[PDB]
Each structure stands twice: as structure tokens, then as C-alpha cells.
Amino acid sequence: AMDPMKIADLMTLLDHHVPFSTAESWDNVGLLIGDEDVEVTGVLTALDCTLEVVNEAIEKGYNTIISHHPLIFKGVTSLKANGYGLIIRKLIQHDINLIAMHTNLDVNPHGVNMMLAKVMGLKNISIINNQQDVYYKVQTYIPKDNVGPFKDKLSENGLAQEYCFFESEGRGQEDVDEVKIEFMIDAYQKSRAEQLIKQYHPYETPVFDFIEIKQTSLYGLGVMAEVDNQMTLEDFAADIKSKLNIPSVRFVGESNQKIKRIAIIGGSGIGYEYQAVQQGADVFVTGDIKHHDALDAKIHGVNLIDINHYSEYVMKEGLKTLLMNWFNIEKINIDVEASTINTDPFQYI
Amino acid sequence: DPMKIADLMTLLDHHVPFSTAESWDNVGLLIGDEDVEVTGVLTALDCTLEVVNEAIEKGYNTIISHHPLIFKGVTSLKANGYGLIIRKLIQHDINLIAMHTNLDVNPHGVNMMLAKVMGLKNISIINNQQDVYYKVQKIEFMIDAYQKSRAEQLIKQYHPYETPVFDFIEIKQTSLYGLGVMAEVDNQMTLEDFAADIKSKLNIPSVRFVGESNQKIKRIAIIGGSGIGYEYQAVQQGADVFVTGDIKHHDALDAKIHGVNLIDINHYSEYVMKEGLKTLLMNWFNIEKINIDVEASTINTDPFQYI
Amino acid sequence: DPMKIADLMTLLDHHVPFSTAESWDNVGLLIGDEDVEVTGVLTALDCTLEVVNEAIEKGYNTIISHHPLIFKGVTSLKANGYGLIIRKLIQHDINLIAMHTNLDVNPHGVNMMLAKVMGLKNISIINNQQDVYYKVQKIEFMIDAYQKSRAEQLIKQYHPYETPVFDFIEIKQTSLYGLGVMAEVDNQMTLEDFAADIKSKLNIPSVRFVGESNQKIKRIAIIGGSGIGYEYQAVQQGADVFVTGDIKHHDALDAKIHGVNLIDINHYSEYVMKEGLKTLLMNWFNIEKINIDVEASTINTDPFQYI
Amino acid sequence: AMDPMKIADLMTLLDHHVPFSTAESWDNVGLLIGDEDVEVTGVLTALDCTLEVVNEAIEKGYNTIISHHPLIFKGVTSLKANGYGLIIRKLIQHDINLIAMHTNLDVNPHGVNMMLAKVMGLKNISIINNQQDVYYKVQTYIPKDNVGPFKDKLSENGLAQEYCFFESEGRGQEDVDEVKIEFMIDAYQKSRAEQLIKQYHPYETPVFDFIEIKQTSLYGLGVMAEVDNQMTLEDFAADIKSKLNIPSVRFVGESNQKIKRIAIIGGSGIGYEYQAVQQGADVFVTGDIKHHDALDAKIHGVNLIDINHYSEYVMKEGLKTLLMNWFNIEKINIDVEASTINTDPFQYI
Amino acid sequence: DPMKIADLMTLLDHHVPFSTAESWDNVGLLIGDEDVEVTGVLTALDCTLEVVNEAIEKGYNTIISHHPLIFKGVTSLKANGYGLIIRKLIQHDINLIAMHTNLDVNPHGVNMMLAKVMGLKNISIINNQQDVYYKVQKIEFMIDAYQKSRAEQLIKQYHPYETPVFDFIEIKQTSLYGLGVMAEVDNQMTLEDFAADIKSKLNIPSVRFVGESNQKIKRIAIIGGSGIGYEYQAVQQGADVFVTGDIKHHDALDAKIHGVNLIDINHYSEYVMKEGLKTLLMNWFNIEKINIDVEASTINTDPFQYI
Amino acid sequence: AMDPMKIADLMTLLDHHVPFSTAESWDNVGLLIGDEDVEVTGVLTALDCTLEVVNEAIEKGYNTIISHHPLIFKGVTSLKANGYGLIIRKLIQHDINLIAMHTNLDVNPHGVNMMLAKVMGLKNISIINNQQDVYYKVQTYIPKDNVGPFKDKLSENGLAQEYCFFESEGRGQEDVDEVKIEFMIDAYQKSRAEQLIKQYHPYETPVFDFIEIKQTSLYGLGVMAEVDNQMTLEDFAADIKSKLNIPSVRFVGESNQKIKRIAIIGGSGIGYEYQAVQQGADVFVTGDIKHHDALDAKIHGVNLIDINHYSEYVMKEGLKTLLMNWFNIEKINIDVEASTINTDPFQYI
Ligand SMILES: [Zn+2]
Ligand SMILES: [Zn+2]
Ligand SMILES: [Zn+2]
Ligand SMILES: [Zn+2]
Ligand SMILES: [Zn+2]
Ligand SMILES: [Zn+2]
Ligand SMILES: [Zn+2]
Ligand SMILES: [Zn+2]
Ligand SMILES: [Zn+2]
Ligand SMILES: [Zn+2]
Ligand SMILES: [Zn+2]
Ligand SMILES: [Zn+2]
């Protein structure tokens, strides 16, 4: 009997590749509207889950929408037949499930900013503004003959996974010859490590320490990348306008300024431009740039390009490609399509 | 007609104005479509999953609860918890209206209803809101604060003066609306006898009181739900005892040490508004010649079981 | 005379009272010496280094900008960034005056100016401030709220009464001042045609709108600069479209989903106040027989270049 | 000449067994009203120090009351002959001393929740919600021949207490063969360790490090325990109503729900119920449960019992027993009695 | 009678209303029993242990201090620090009353007392509070804001109208109460000569002033204690110099650079209220024919010794 | 061609000896008014940069003022010809540069409080209230034959500066014999250490850890010192009144109290007096003491002397001496003078 993919199965897969925990703590991510128990009939990717996107899912026979922007952000205080209420009610009434992969996708090594850089034809792309992840170096002290079965039992129970220990010789008190064994755990394992250590240790009152270690994460908001060939600011702006099919672009800085290194935060990344320049950027590319921030940037020589917040729409095809690949790996046959609807609230003239 | 949700909302607003609710509250049409024709109305304290099933079973597409099912914003709508209730409403085209603190402060609302279920006399609203009006000024006449704009559009439109002369003088008056009632028994009774009396009249499994059992009670202040914070002011207003729910140890100990008598009839005693609201709505419907069924939900939705 | 900075400040205050500015704003003489004789006045949106160089070159020692060059307090004055501009003003004895939110809310200010550059009709201030006056009371007569003290020093000084009897009755009236204007086109036009029309009239490189291109527009609300926050209220006030700058994605998406039409003419479109303010000041100077040159800065100070 | 116990001596003993530092930082604990210098004539334990409790101390000739709840919590702005003022004035006027052992006793391994679990007849009782205590692993580097007198001097001065060091061999710079010696200190000792190390080290400029270590405390708010035999929620509720002589109990959950593991926070512990369930509880037992929190718990399947906040009264006899034992150990002859007054503000009908 | 603490409190409230104290303050009966008969009253700035010993020694069971011995809530009452004082009061049945900011803003309070000790003329309260009254409205007459309730209970009780028509019109008037006095010397004097004059009249060990020593002084503003924050407003009100205590370096430097003259007479100079309050209370007692001894504490409680 | 000292050069020197980073985060320090590019013609030290001080710089031909107090503290919202505006405009109009060495000088081992103690003739002067500086112990694991060129490359690139490593032998997994090498970095180096380690390590995926270490700083607010000979509080007060030429001093405490150890925070240090007593002070010396704080101190037995905030004026001559010395070391010929103007806003009578 089959194991068709349920929303719960899809969530586990999504979380494996683009962990929901990497989203900012103010964000609203994951299954926003739906039922974990329901079988997935098809997946439509979207930037914003507008009414037209919901109609498109219905029309295609897909019961799952993955959007970048969370349709419910600050809690809803009503669900009436108007505004965002009309969209949420339509999802529910048609048994459509909506998952938001928001700032977790903004900070993912294969996420919105990698996608933007790739669509711009850039090279040497890497994550910037890296998160810090908390780990612990576990240190226990144990007699040499006790070292093996202590290690095997900790390893049998999934610690140091495999069997990754570092062994140090020393003398406790030199009353007692001991082996100081070390290994790494993620922050959530501390309590279980304690349990296992106390349980399988030789000493009645065993001696063990957790030393907090911070490591630079692979996750971070933005990428730094480079153009193949150093070019002028205005030429770079024109090139990316064309590549992303943007109706209008605006830039801040001398039009003939030479550009090689590019920092990109899709959406609304103003606030990071000065740090981007400190990180080596010649220009900071983002959306939703306002007058006074552009004015400040100009006077300080910080070069900007506004590609519009709407340029995050690249994640529809990008996430479709990712998900198709993840599904291939797992041998899952479910269709994924990028929504073709242009959902930009702005029309340019 | 037939009566739509939009028309029901207008009527309810007329009798229990939604603007008398507290600013933090969430009242009105919480879940639904104002264009839908009302098939029947079920009244509820809390809109539980069982209450939604009762509406469906009775053929009613409208529920009016006291407590707002959505209070702080909901950040997801999953098939779990409160999500299940909200999703069931939507999937069955059931409209949910919340008449919350507007009903707590209404002259015919929760506290009137409590006082009447208790058999009390000389019941009056306490803790009255303050309404703002303007005495428009040499002629003079009144206006609601909201008419100030239109009145001026009117005033400045026609007058002999190149610049007509007029004044809006802010006047404040005691509202008919407020949180709680003061009321009285027919004859003085002991605090313990009064507590038992109301236990029995409200069908409460357990009541608790603060104060000597032989304290004599004539004047009673009532705030249904969770009214702790108002007990000192009630005594100030003449109360021999403050009646509310959800009384906690330290608040009761403070009251005891200050000589303030309390009775905890439980928050759940607000359930009286089910039948109370059904009666009101039947009467309002009768005035407007609306032939729509109203029933009080019969489900006991108290999360507590007493032993 | 000759007119000093102190005299100019008095005049500007008379016509565009600095007290109508928002409490968070920074307006008035920001950089300078009130005793210095004005040689000429250059009007500006933003006081950039290029604008200071233009003043110097024209022989003008006074600049009036809309945007305050010093807004939050500056914690240093170095030869870098905004420091360079501030230091250049000081070292060339150039006086800088900021007519900021006081000009945004004036009946002849930024939004009147925008509406006129757009060719609009029936232009009126919206979002009006409220002025406080006192009806002094049996005689009765008016006073500005600021006269309450002096009036009383006067009132209590001479009266038959050992204790004269008098009342100050607070009266509130709609101000002539407020943020934004409502106005109308001569004949209904599509939203896209209106957007293009104003693009052309204001010489804007790029405009963007929210709403169906064939929406019909007659009534228009305008808040120059960054007026998002006021669009729902404008529709409430009758607007078919809200015109402002600095519109961001999520605010535009919200408006679109609620049926609220917008046009982003860019914050930089406040530049119309350069010529607008020059015309006002020339007229005021003419009334007072002041022979001082006023010119609108010709420098395009938009930090954005469009492609 | 005698050393009769003074309030100061009693405070030291109380603090040894139920450290005042384990109280929450918002709490008001310790000697609230009295004189450290005064000789203790007898001790009366209480939940709340009401006027009747003060009269009872006077009547018995006891000059010391230890309550759980602090009679002064937020500061008093007056001391008049009414309300709480009347109680505080009576203490002072009769030279009665009042000590509050409040949240320090809530979190103690022998405190309010252990007492509650014991009175309920539960087994396998352990502290939950454990505090974290900050320690340091001190690391110094020292030549082998210098190791002994360095160690002895640090130990003579009460560090590593005894003589608990761990010894590591290594090469500094291999210009210099060194011994890396390690030991533990509590957080308050850092400065003294620094002093002693600098003082007795071989090197003119000695090399030493303090590495912060967090350890799970023995102190925590609540206990987890189990019934001898799995029973129904309603049967468990009835049993504990009887054992604690409670006039009325209420529960939330299906009456026939099977219960084995019980989390208990006496007083007002709502806020911890969801975490208790994550920790393995079948039911969360507490007091002062309000409607909307009970409603939430019901819909989420979290089972609750309200035993009333007043059920903290078990600490009168419990603390009497503890104190009698502590006094026996120290050979102190001072009487301790649990106040017999029922001080519950509520009467049930 | 004999006069109880409750009666004393009523009298003091009549002459120096406790409601004129700041909302953050702690005034009234701080420590004591309102039912106890007053044996005698000692006045104090700070109620130190030495002042309590003085009361005990004189046979007085009532102390009135300016500064509240309990200000923020006390979290313990031990035989140490302030605990020792509070416990000594209680154990000797001594009643402590604090007349704090109510005395600072009274027309016969701390600042009147300072100005009189200085020999000044034309002394008037400054920084006046605002009292709210209602003109009840065709008859019309006044009421204190507190009478609004009773008046309405009365008003609505008897009238021809089924619904009587009445208005409460909020009127605001300048209070007699406020923080500080303005006053003047008989003849202009230098700032240094004035500072020395007041040093001598108040027996101050050390005074310090801000401003040129030859500045001419006629009009003086005084806020006893720690009145920094009010010096710019005092100059606005006509003061040549602002006199207060507890002046710090940066506040003095700011004043100096702005041309605002100051004198620091020390916070401790509020001690004048001991004799000042004794005289007031003797007079009030004389009016009511109360034969109770009042004495000003003779203890110098300044924590500072000057060298 | 010459390298005359520019403001930028002076700032680097100032920062070397009295690091601007040791200032409190609310403070406003460094070049407040001026141009980094401008050549320094002379330096005038000041407590407060009043108009007279600016006139004095002009008159002397000096274009640089270093003050203790920042003339711009909370941002200026205008620069008009009055008040502080007149002073700032005069600086600018005369091309005078103004640097503030504020709380960095309050906390410096040779700063305001060392200067005060020295002028008082005190002995055994040391910094109190020490800052804590964050460092990292870097730990990498590497095979023995790889140890040399790994070390040399890290050292070639300026880590462990020189060549300060500690070497530990151990077994990774005993599959692999490894050397655990350790060294110290300042907190700002973490990212570069990561770069260098990844770059020059043997392992494709090298194993390395940063362990946060806090060390007691040499910087702190205040000093503790002692009088040569134990003396009475009143005698000490009189002595320091004379030594600092103060017009009036006031003290709190019994006039015959014996004083040996003195804590000093020049300026306005009330808030630290209780901690000073805990640190061993017999008296806390500061300025701007107010009534109620003095009253509190008296009742608690905390002895105080108010030497006035203006007594920070000792830093004019003190900083002149320091700067002359720093300039001598660098062979810089620029004149430094302490402003002679008494800028105390107070006149005493
Ligand atoms: Zn994004
Ligand atoms: Zn976005
Ligand atoms: Zn209610
Ligand atoms: Zn309720
Ligand atoms: Zn504007
Ligand atoms: Zn603007
Ligand atoms: Zn407790
Ligand atoms: Zn408790
Ligand atoms: Zn005062
Ligand atoms: Zn005072
Ligand atoms: Zn300083
Ligand atoms: Zn200072």
C-alpha cells in the first residue's frame, strides 16, 4: 500500500534542504494554511499567494502552494469575504495548502540571492552576513581501559556521528591516570548527552563539561559575487534590467563608476549597504530603496541599484528547479510548476 | 430581505454598539461573508468545535458568541487546535460574530443577565463610560461627536456671515454603557447564604467566597468573567460584595485583609448570555418583523470538570 | 532694513507658521546668524554640496530648503559626508533655513504646488489640524490659546468684582493647515492616462501605479514625499487614487488587494517646491516692498538615476 | 558563655540548605522584618503571615516566623494601622522576626513540589525546569618542576576544593615543555583565582584562562513524578483532593484519560503546562487556573488539575520537618511548629 | 477632641491639600495610627534617627517632615539603615506625616518661606497648576470637578423634564498652587552681593553662583530643593536669576553659556520649612482652638559638612 | 618631503595610548569637529571647550584642541550664533579642530583618576571597576609532520604574535595521531583566523574551534589608592582641598573617621560608592554629590567627599604631560599647552 506524499512528508523534505529554523524570529514560516495529513496532488510556487495564484492552483488540480512571502504575517484578526480574507477563505474552501518559505529561503546557500546572482550571470557567488550556530565541545575524563565501551555506548546511542572522538592523556587528582575524551554536539543535544554520559560513565559521580563553541553558519542574508568583466555602474544596471526583465531600474552613484564586486539582498535590504561596502562590495543591489536612504548613500559614496522588491519573483522558477531535484532524489513523481502570473502590484509607465 | 449578515450586523450594532467594546477587543463579524442570507442564529459563550457541529446539525449558518474565537491574530490555520474550528466554520459556510466587551458593558448585557438570573432588584450599570457630544453655538443645539465634520460642512455652507460665527463646545456626559451592575437582594442575607443562593440559581458546581460567612449582604456588584481590579472601586460605590470569576489566591488574600468581600462564581458563569442573548435577539427580530429562528447553544463548554 | 535673517524668519513664520510643523521635525534657522543681512535667497529641496556652491556663485547668503539638512542631531562635523556641506555653509557665512513639514501642511504649500503642477481643480487641504481657541466669558469674545495667560493678567486686573467672574471655554476648530490636498481633474480619465499625464507634467523619468489601468479617476488625493499610511483615509475622504512617493512592495500589494489605487510619483517630486516657494516669497517680498532676489535652485538633486 | 542561635545564625543555616540565591530575581526573600542580632526563641512556619499567624507566634512565645509567601513583596509605601500595615506593625511592636523562603523553596529539591508529590503518594520524583549554574574551568600553563608548590599554594588558599586538578603535558613556544593544569571554580571566585594565580605563578607574566562552563543545577521549578499504578484522570484528581484535604478540585481533560506521569508546580504555574507535556507529563498539576487557559489546554489536549494555590500550605509541616532535622544536625534545641491556622482566603460551598 | 491623627490630617489637607502633590510622590500619613491622640508635633526636613529621638525626648508622638521617609516602597524593615528609623517610630508609637510636594507648591509653602527668609518683596507663585471646574448649564453655576457625579445624581433627580436638559462645560483655571515663586529685592544688587546676602540670611556654609559677579539682579525665581529643569522657563517668566539646590556641573555650564544666571543655595536650604511649618500649624491650631504644642526640630540633618 | 603630523596621525597616536574603543557606548569621542587631512600647528588641552578656550587657541596659533568633555554630546539640531552654536561655528570658521578624549580617558590607567590620585599625593594606585575584554582560544588539530609549515604560515600572516603556540598530542578518530595546537586571538580576528586556517590546513575539511575567553582589562572607571599615613576624614578632605586648590569641599561621614584606602571617580561617580566600599574603600571621592544620595550614604556609613566635578580640570596639565611624552617618543616637535582658563561655571562665596 502506497506511501503517497502527505503535506507532513513535504514539510520534512523542505525543512531538510531549507531549514525553517534559519528564518528570522519575527518571520512566519512553514505550513500557514492547511492539513499535514492531506495527500499532495501537485505543487505551485509563487512569490505572493494572490487570488489569481489560488485560482491557478485550482485550475491545474494542485492542492499545495509554496510562496516566498507569508500570506499571514501578523496574525489575522478576521476572515471575511474581502481583502486577504477572500484569499485565505478560498484556500480553505478548496482544500488548498499554503506553505511559506520566507526568510529561510532568503538566507539559504541556494536561496533567493544565489538565484538573483545566477540570473545576473555573476561568478564567485558566496553567502554573506553569515549566521552563527551554537555547538558544544563535550569533554569527559575516563580511565584508559574504560575508554572503548564508554565510546561504543555513546556512539551506539548516536553521539559523535561516526565515532568522532579526540583522545588526550593526562593525570587526575598524579593519583589517577585518565583519558580526556572530546567530541562535538549540536546545541539541542546537551541534555541527552548529559543523560547518556551519566548513564554509561565508570565514575559514580562522573566529571564532564560542555564548552560552548560558535561556528560560522553556511546560512546568511545576501551574497557577494562578481561580474565576469569589470564594467560601469550604468552598464551593470542596464544589463541586469534586461536579464531580469525589469520595467524600470534606478541607481545611485556616478554612472561611469567601475564595478566588479556586487552585494545582493533581494527584497528590501536597505540597512545592509554600508556593511556590504565594508565587506568589499562596489555596489549594493536591492529593492524598495527610498529617497533619504539613496541621498545618504550618494553623499557617502555607497553605490546602489534598485532592481525592485518584485525581482524576488526569480524564486518561483528557482524553487521549482530545486524542488524537482529534491523530488528526483527521493523518487517522488509529484508535479511542480512555477506560477506564471505576474503579481507585481506596480505597473510602470 | 431575506436578512443578510450585513443586515444582522446593523441591527446588533444598533442595540449593542460595537464601538462600546474595549479598544483591545476583537468584535463584529470575525469569520464569514456579509452578503450571505442568515438561515438561523445559535448563541454561544465559547465557539467550540461541538458548537460548530450543533449549528450545522440545526441548519444554522450564523453563530454569535460572547468570546471572540480569534482574539490575537492567528498566525496559522491548520487542522489542529483552534485551527480546526475556524476551518470547519469556513468549510461549512458558517458565519461567526463576536459580541464581546460591547455585551459586557450593555445595559441589557452580561451583567444585567447575571443580576436577573440571581433574582436581584434595583439593578443599575456601574463604571459608566463617558460620551462626548458638542453643544453647537445666537442659536444652540446638540450633536454627536461624529457629526462635528458634517455639521461644519453644513454650518459653513449657509450663513449670512462672510465668515459665519459658530462654536463647537465639547460636552461630556455619563454613558448608559459600563462594566458591571450594582443591584440588591430583597432582604439582607448572610454572605454564605447569598453565595449558596447564587450557586443554586446559576447551576454552579462549586462556588467560593472571601469574607466572614455571617457578613450581611444587601448591595451587590457584579462583573461577569474576570473582573478582579474593580473590587475596591465597587466597595467605594456601595457594594457589600463583589461577584466575579477567575479569582486568584493573592487577590483574594488582599481583599480579605482589606475587608473586601468577594464571591467567585467562575468565569464560566457568563454562559447565562446564551439564553439572555437569544431572548434579546428574538425581541429585536419581533420589532423588525424578521422571521428567523434563534436558539441558545445547549452545549456545556466549561473546560473544567469539578469534583 | 536692510532685511536681516531675523526679519526673514518673522515673515516666513507669518505665512507658513513654523508651529504647524510636526513635533518630531526640525525647522527654522538651522545654520546661521540671525543678525546677518540677507543678500539673496536660493530655494532648494535638499541642500546638497552643489546647492551650496550655487548659492556662493550667485552671491546669495541664504538658502531655504524643504528637507532639513540637520534632522537628528549631528554628533560630529568633519570634512566628510554631510559634514562637508554644513562646514561649507558656515565657512562661507551662508544661512540655511528649513521649511519642512510646515510647508507640507500649508494651504499654499507642497501639496497645493503638486496639484497645480498637475493642472488640477477644486483643490482643498485634507487631514486638517485642530486649532484650540478660548471663548472668554455677561460678555463673550474669542482668543488664541496662547492669549489665555495675558488675557487673565488683563481680566483679573480690572473688574468691578473683588473676584471678577470669568470663564475660558476651550473651543476646537478645524485648521486651515493639513497634510495633503484633495483635488480633481476636469474630466474623468483612466488611471493609466492620469499617471502618464502627471509623469509628463512633472518631468518624471518613471512613474508606477497600483490598480487596473482602466480604473476611472476624478478625485485625487496627494501627499508629496512619503505619504503611505494615509491612503485608506484618502479613499474614505472620496479619493479615486492616492498620489505619493516612496511606495514599497508590501504597501502597494495591500492597497491592490483592498482596491485602493495608488500612484508613485517618487519622493523627489517634492522638487516642485523650489519654484513654488520662489513664487510665494517674491509675492510676500512685493507686499512688504523688500527688494531682495529669490531664485529656485536649478540643480537636479535626485540621488536616483533611472534607466 | 553560650552561643544561643541569633537570627543571623538561623539565616546562614536556611541559606545553606535552601539558598536564597536560587530565588527568582523579582522575588523578595530572606529576613523581611526583624533584627539579625536577636536571639531566636522559637520558630513558626506559615504559608502566608496573616494577623492570626502573628497572634499565634505571640501566644506561643515564638519570635520568629518563616513564611513561604513574602508579606512585603512590592515595597510598602506606608505602615498604617490597617491592612497589611497592621500585620507589619504588630510584628515590629512585638519584636517578631519574619523570614520569607519563597521561590528558593519552590525550586529546592526538598521544597514545595517535592512536598506536594510526597503528600500525593507519588514515586520517582525529580526536579524539572532546572536552573543553569555558571562555573569556570581555570587553565594555567606551568613547568613540570614548578607544578607541586604552585598546586599546594593554590590549594592552601582553598582553590580546587580537595586538591582536584587535571594535568596535561605539552610544549609552549618546542621551546618550552609545560604542564597545562586545569581545575574548576564557581563563578564568584574568578577574581580571587586571578589574584592567587598571578601571585604564586613561576612566570613574571603568567598565562591563564577562564573558560565559562554551564552545568545543570539541582534546583528547578516543579517536579515530575509518577503514580504507583496508571489511573484515570478523574480518579487521580479525587485521590489528591482527599490526600491534600481540598474542598474542591477541578480538572481539564477526558475524565477517563490514563495518567502515569505527573508534573507539579504548586501555586500558580500556568505558563509551564505545554513544556511539562513536552517533558513527558500526562497531566500538569497547579493552582489558580483561569478559564481561557483551561480552554486552550482542553483544545490542545493538555490535561490539567487545579488543586488550588492554597495547596502550597503543605510547606508548613514540610518546612517544620526539614528545619527540625537541620537543627538536630547542628544540635540546636529551638522549637519549631507548623502554624495550624487555615489562612485560605477562600471558603468553598 | 482631643485631636487625633485623623483630625490633624483633615486640617493639614484643608490648608495644604495632599492632592496638589505630584503623582509620583508619597505624602500623608506614612507611618502611624489615625486613631491615636496627638500629644505634640515636631517639624522636620528629613526624619533622621536623631529627629525620632528628639520627638521621644520632648514627649511628642507626631512628626511632620517635608521629605518622605518612605518614598519608593521599602522591601524590608531590618535593624539597619532607614529600617532603624522606621522601626523606632513604630516601636515608640510615633506617627510620621509627610508634607512633601504639596508643601513645595503651596502659596505659603517652601518657596514662600525661602523668599521670606531672604527678605524678598512681591512674592508670587509661578509654574501654576490648572484646576478643572465645570460650569453646569437656562440656569448656570459652578462646581468642582469632583461634584460632577453628585450634581448629576441631584440634577437628574428633580426636573420638570422627563429628560432634564443639562450640560457640564469643562472650564480650566489657573491654580493658586505651583512650583516656585518669583519675587524681587527692594533695590537692584549685584549677583555676587545677592548670593552673599542669602548665604548669610540662610546660614549656609557655602554658596555658589553661575553668571558674572557684576550682573544686576532685581527679579528672582526660587525652587527649593532640586529645581534644575525650570531655569530656562524662569528666565522666560522674567527672572534675573534662578535659585535652587543640587546644581551639577553640566547644568551650570549650559546655563552659563546661555546667559542664564543661577545660585546654588544647596538642597538642604529647604530646612527653612521646619520653622515655617511650625508657624503655620500654630496659627491653624489657634483658629480651631487646638491647644497642642508644635516645635521645629533643632537638629541640623545636613549629611554634608563643609570645609 | 616632510611628513608633518596631520589630524589623522594625531588620532592614531591618541588612540594607541588611550583607545577610543574603551569609551562607554553612549559617549561621543574622537574627532568631533574638524578635518583629518589638516596639518596640526599646535595642541591646547582643555576640560570643557568654552568660547574663551577657542579664543586662546586662536591667539596662540594652535589649530587643535583636545578636551575631556565632548562639546557635542547629544547631536546638535542647529548651529546658530548663540550658545554652543557660537563655539562650534567659531571652531569651524577658524579651522580649529576639536577632539574629545572623554570616558576613554576616565578609564585609562594613566587617565583622569590616576591624575587625581597623583595630585592628592596618594600611593599604591590601581584601576578599579575593570572592563572585560573578549578573546578567543583557537584550537586546531593537525598531523605532526604538518605542524611546522602550518604554524609558519599562520605566523607569516600575523597570527599568534611572535609564534606563540601551545602543542598537545592526542589521537583523533586511535585511527589518527594528531597535534592539537592552540593560540590566542583578539575578538576582531576570528573571521581572518577562519580564513587563514581553512587556507593553510592539511585537511580538506579542517577541524578548528574558537573558545571565548574573557580577561580582566587594564581599563576601568576609578582608582583605589592609599594615603601615606592613615588620617581623619576631615583632615583628608582639607588636604585634598588644598592640593587641588578647590574653593569649597564637603564630606559625608564622622569628621574623625580614620581613612586609609580611597576610591576616586572624578566627575560625577555617584552610583559607585557602595561598590567602592565593597572593594575596600574607606571613602569615595567624586563630584556633583546631591542631598538624597549623601543622606543615603550617611545612614549606611558610606563615607564621601565631594571635590566637585570641576576637579577633573587636572587632566589639562596631565594630558599635556602625557602628549608631550608620546610626541617625544615619536620625535614630533609640535607644541602642547594646557589651557590656563578656569572654565568652572561656578563661583564660590
Ligand atoms: Zn525575500
Ligand atoms: Zn520580500
Ligand atoms: Zn464578558
Ligand atoms: Zn469572559
Ligand atoms: Zn515634504
Ligand atoms: Zn520629503
Ligand atoms: Zn510557591
Ligand atoms: Zn505561591
Ligand atoms: Zn521640596
Ligand atoms: Zn527636597
Ligand atoms: Zn571624566
Ligand atoms: Zn566629567
GROMACS .gro file of N, CA and C in nm, chain A residues 132 137 144 151 162-167 182 184 211 213-214 216, chain F residues 139 141 169-174 178 180 190 194 208-211:
model
   96
  132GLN      N    1   2.550   3.257   1.307
  132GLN     CA    2   2.641   3.183   1.396
  132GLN      C    3   2.559   3.073   1.460
  137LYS      N    4   3.153   2.162   2.270
  137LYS     CA    5   3.256   2.060   2.282
  137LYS      C    6   3.236   1.992   2.417
  144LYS      N    7   4.177   0.461   3.103
  144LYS     CA    8   4.210   0.408   2.970
  144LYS      C    9   4.136   0.278   2.934
  151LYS      N   10   3.297   0.477   2.475
  151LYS     CA   11   3.284   0.532   2.340
  151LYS      C   12   3.178   0.464   2.255
  162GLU      N   13   3.076   0.892   1.177
  162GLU     CA   14   3.052   0.832   1.309
  162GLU      C   15   3.178   0.816   1.397
  163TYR      N   16   3.155   0.792   1.526
  163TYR     CA   17   3.262   0.761   1.623
  163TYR      C   18   3.376   0.865   1.624
  164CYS      N   19   3.338   0.992   1.616
  164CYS     CA   20   3.435   1.102   1.606
  164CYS      C   21   3.470   1.153   1.744
  165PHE      N   22   3.583   1.106   1.795
  165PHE     CA   23   3.632   1.145   1.926
  165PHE      C   24   3.774   1.195   1.908
  166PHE      N   25   3.817   1.281   1.999
  166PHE     CA   26   3.958   1.314   2.016
  166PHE      C   27   4.005   1.275   2.158
  167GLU      N   28   4.118   1.206   2.164
  167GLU     CA   29   4.169   1.147   2.290
  167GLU      C   30   4.300   1.210   2.340
  182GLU      N   31   3.706   1.397   2.392
  182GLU     CA   32   3.630   1.513   2.344
  182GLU      C   33   3.546   1.479   2.219
  184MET      N   34   3.192   1.666   1.961
  184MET     CA   35   3.103   1.778   1.930
  184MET      C   36   2.959   1.736   1.940
  211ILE      N   37   3.149   2.291   2.662
  211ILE     CA   38   3.210   2.418   2.628
  211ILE      C   39   3.141   2.470   2.504
  213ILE      N   40   3.080   2.646   2.173
  213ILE     CA   41   3.158   2.681   2.054
  213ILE      C   42   3.061   2.745   1.954
  214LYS      N   43   3.098   2.860   1.899
  214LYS     CA   44   3.022   2.918   1.792
  214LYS      C   45   3.098   2.895   1.663
  216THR      N   46   3.068   2.969   1.226
  216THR     CA   47   3.007   3.044   1.121
  216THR      C   48   2.919   2.954   1.039
 1758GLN      N   49   4.170   2.658   1.861
 1758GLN     CA   50   4.218   2.521   1.870
 1758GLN      C   51   4.203   2.455   1.733
 1760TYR      N   52   4.346   2.091   1.506
 1760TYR     CA   53   4.401   1.957   1.516
 1760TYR      C   54   4.470   1.925   1.384
 1788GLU      N   55   4.956   1.660   2.229
 1788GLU     CA   56   4.948   1.539   2.148
 1788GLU      C   57   4.824   1.459   2.186
 1789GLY      N   58   4.761   1.399   2.085
 1789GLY     CA   59   4.641   1.319   2.106
 1789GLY      C   60   4.606   1.237   1.983
 1790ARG      N   61   4.502   1.155   1.994
 1790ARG     CA   62   4.461   1.067   1.885
 1790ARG      C   63   4.318   1.098   1.842
 1791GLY      N   64   4.300   1.132   1.714
 1791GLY     CA   65   4.168   1.152   1.657
 1791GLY      C   66   4.111   1.019   1.610
 1792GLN      N   67   3.982   1.020   1.577
 1792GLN     CA   68   3.915   0.902   1.521
 1792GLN      C   69   3.778   0.938   1.460
 1793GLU      N   70   4.262   0.423   1.794
 1793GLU     CA   71   4.309   0.559   1.763
 1793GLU      C   72   4.354   0.566   1.616
 1797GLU      N   73   4.724   1.298   1.617
 1797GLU     CA   74   4.718   1.441   1.585
 1797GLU      C   75   4.786   1.528   1.689
 1799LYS      N   76   4.711   1.882   1.865
 1799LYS     CA   77   4.620   1.990   1.895
 1799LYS      C   78   4.703   2.115   1.926
 1809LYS      N   79   3.867   3.676   1.462
 1809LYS     CA   80   3.801   3.546   1.439
 1809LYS      C   81   3.789   3.515   1.289
 1813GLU      N   82   3.974   3.213   1.079
 1813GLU     CA   83   3.897   3.117   0.996
 1813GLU      C   84   3.949   3.105   0.852
 1827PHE      N   85   3.857   2.294   1.356
 1827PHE     CA   86   3.907   2.409   1.435
 1827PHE      C   87   3.795   2.471   1.518
 1828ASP      N   88   3.832   2.522   1.636
 1828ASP     CA   89   3.737   2.577   1.733
 1828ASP      C   90   3.785   2.711   1.789
 1829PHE      N   91   3.690   2.801   1.813
 1829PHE     CA   92   3.713   2.926   1.883
 1829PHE      C   93   3.637   2.920   2.014
 1830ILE      N   94   3.714   2.925   2.122
 1830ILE     CA   95   3.660   2.922   2.256
 1830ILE      C   96   3.672   3.063   2.313
   0.00000   0.00000   0.00000
